[PDB]
């Protein structure tokens, strides 16, 4: 019966002093220099960046006062490069709790030929900041989680070693979906597997230009798409946005109706619910050298930060 409940699942709606204080609590100066500039560095799979990425992450989460446990799975997969090995990063408050709300992101980037680097500024170093920014911002309140938890998941591996296909694409991803999917949760159930216990994953992609548009991929997950939409309204009226318009709206309610592959695909298959905050287009920036720190839009991530933390604070009752 308990895998039911994400479908009944209610927000707690935060009234507008608690707005302002999560609009407060959350500083996008100091996500900049301590969560996002280690992250802009070479970073793909077995990289000495990618050993470097996954340090800083780990390191960020473990110095929060909340409970965090870290779990990296490693493995080995074929690639057009020869074998590589692959490490996700798992984050996870309240591990036995039946439930985790589950936010994700890849923290590797894509390799390109060899005076320009590719850092992947909005591919995804900003996602990875602003989760681990979030897990700062709400530590406090996080802290008094101590049958519903939350969950972050930075993917290794997501791109493409040479030409995006099935089997060079999403590595990390389709691994960590069938680990989760083949592992009883709670320990001991019959049945259930770690992927019921998704409630759901919100997959962060390709943040960081100017005026993204994330469109309402997905029915079963389109109510908790308004949400969003209404938390970005609410806090624009509030004033708590900066540079930011009512005609220019982050979250449309109209859908894609393609098919955007990401690291959700492993994960959507096999029935779990997916908000993918993913901008439809893509960054113009999108995988070329420019896709830097240079083009980023510090407001906007700034806005992007306290709707993301309204939503998961109300997603949480907390
Ligand atoms: C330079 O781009 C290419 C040229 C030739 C062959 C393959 C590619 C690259 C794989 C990418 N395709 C994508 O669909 C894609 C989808 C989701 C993503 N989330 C972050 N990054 C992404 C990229
Ligand atoms: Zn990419």
New binding site residues.
Partial sequence: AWPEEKNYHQPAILNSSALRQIAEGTSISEMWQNDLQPLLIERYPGSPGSYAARQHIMQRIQRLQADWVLEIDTFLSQTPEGERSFSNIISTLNPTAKRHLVLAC?YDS?YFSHNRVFVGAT??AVPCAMMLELARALDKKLLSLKDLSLQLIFFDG???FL??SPQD?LYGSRHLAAKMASTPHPPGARGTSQLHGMDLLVLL??IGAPNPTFPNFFPNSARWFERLQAIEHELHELGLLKDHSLEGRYFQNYSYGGV???DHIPFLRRGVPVLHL?PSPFPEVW?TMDDNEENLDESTIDNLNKILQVFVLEYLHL
Avoid: G, M, P, R
Wanted: net charge negative; glycine share 0%.
């Fill in positions: 890849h894509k591919d995804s997501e791109e493409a030409h995006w694409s992609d390709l955007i592959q990401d993913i995988h």
